[PDB]
């Protein structure tokens, strides 16, 4: 709504829906992984107030992406597959107009990729439970 563009929601239908909504500016993204992707922590700006959100499960190790001045998320890729009877993100990575990150996780599966030729990622939405079942993004020029 309000002219938002939300693409994807890659993963399984398990867990419970989460939605960060779009950010005025993303400060950092911390991906937590082990065999698969556990969760994602996002620190951003909204209404001139800094916020942090915790999505997915609490396990895994942290991998942090800090966006410098003028750096933006222009790509997201990963893999979805089964893990103990549940379809979730086995791998996840991002790219910025400066460098690529990840992928993080170790469980292979059905790949997916979202290279962005024009525009950037501005927020996240998806599904979380014990792990990160599904992840999608908000886009903007």
Ligand X SMILES: CO[C@H]1O[C@H](CO)[C@@H](O)[C@H](O[C@@H]2OC[C@@H](O)[C@H](O)[C@H]2O)[C@@H]1O
Which lies closer to a copy of itself via its Cβ, residue 5 or residue 100?
5
Which of the choices ligand X, a copy of itself, none does residue 118 contact, using the CB cut-off of 5 to 8 A by kind? a copy of itself
d(CA 26, CA 82): 30
* Burial letters 111-138, b for 16+ CB under 10 A, else e: ebebebeeebbbbbbbbbbbbbbbbbbb
Q: Is 125 a binder of a copy of itself (CB under 8 A)?
A: yes
Rule CB under 8 A: is residue 3 a binding residue for a copy of itself?
yes
Q: How many CA atoms lie within 13 A of 125 on its CB side?
A: 15
Size of the site for a copy of itself (CB under 8 A): 24
Tell me which stretch binds a copy of itself (CB under 8 A): 34-42, 56-64, 81-89, 114-122.
114-122
- Least Å from the CB of residue 106 to ligand X: 8
Residue 37 in contact with a copy of itself, rule: CB under 8 A: no
């Amino acid at each position: 709504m309000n002219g938002a563009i939300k693409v994807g929601a890659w993963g399984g239908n398990g867990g419970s829906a989460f939605d960060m909504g779009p950010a005025y500016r993303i400060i950092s993204v911390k991906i937590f992984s082990g065999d698969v992707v556990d969760g994602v922590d996002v620190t951003f700006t909204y209404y001139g107030k800094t916020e942090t959100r915790h999505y997915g499960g609490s396990g895994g190790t942290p991998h942090e992406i800090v966006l410098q001045e003028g750096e933006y998320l222009v790509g997201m890729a990963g893999e979805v597959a089964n893990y103990h009877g549940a379809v979730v993100l086995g791998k996840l990575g991002f790219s910025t107009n400066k460098k690529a990150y990840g992928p993080f996780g170790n469980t292979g599966g059905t790949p997916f990729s979202l290279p962005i030729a024009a525009g950037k990622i501005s927020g996240f939405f998806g599904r979380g439970g014990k792990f990160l079942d599904a992840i999608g993004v908000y886009l903007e020029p």
